[PDB]
């Protein structure tokens, strides 16, 4: 699931996310989602590093 049925984000979606150390937003792909926790792991494009994010903190994709 019911949590997933009411969730906008899905594995593989493009989003943007805050890279907290530099205070700036960057493109990412959602690699994993825990729908109970409402957390995910994103893969930042180009760099390829992974980070946990709250689903609540994901942003609309950067225009491309
Ligand atoms: N692995 C990253 C690294 C940086 N950043 C920040 C950064 C700063 C300037 C820029 F043009 C692109 C990324 C980011 C990631 C992933 C998401 C954003 C800065 C150094 C490594
Ligand atoms: Mg719940
Ligand atoms: Mg669980």
Numbering used by the authors: 84 to 147
Source paper text:
Survival of motor neuron (SMN) functions in diverse biological pathways via recognition of symmetric dimethylarginine (Rme2s) on proteins by its Tudor domain, and deficiency of SMN leads to spinal muscular atrophy. Here we report a potent and selective antagonist with a 4-iminopyridine scaffold targeting the Tudor domain of SMN. In order to understand the structural basis of compound 1 recognition by these reader proteins, we determined the crystal structures of compound 1 in complex with SMN, TDRD3 and UHRF1, respectively. In this study, we identified some low micromolar antagonists with a 4-iminopyridine scaffold targeting the Tudor domain of SMN, and compound 1 shows >4-fold selectivity over other tested methyllysine or methylarginine binding domains.
To explore if we could identify more potent compounds than compound 1, we procured commercially available analogs of compound 1 that include single, double and triple ring molecules and measured their binding affinities to SMN or UHRF1, respectively. SMN bound to all the four triple-ring compounds with affinities between 2.6 and 31 μM. The four triple-ring compounds have a 4-iminopyridine scaffold in common, and none of them is more potent than the original hit. However, the positive binding results of 1-substituted pyridine cores to SMN presented here could confirm that N132 does interact with the imino group and substituents on the pyridine nitrogen would point away from the Tudor domain, as larger 1-substituents would otherwise clash inside the aromatic cage. Indeed, our crystal structure of SMN in complex with compound 4 also confirms that the imino group of compound 4 forms a hydrogen bond with N132. In addition to triple-ring compounds 1 to 4, SMN also bound to two of twelve double-ring compounds, compounds 5 and 6. Both compounds retain the imino group, which pinpoints the importance of the imino group-mediated hydrogen bond in the compound binding and is consistent with our crystal structures of SMN in complex with compounds 1, 4, and 6.
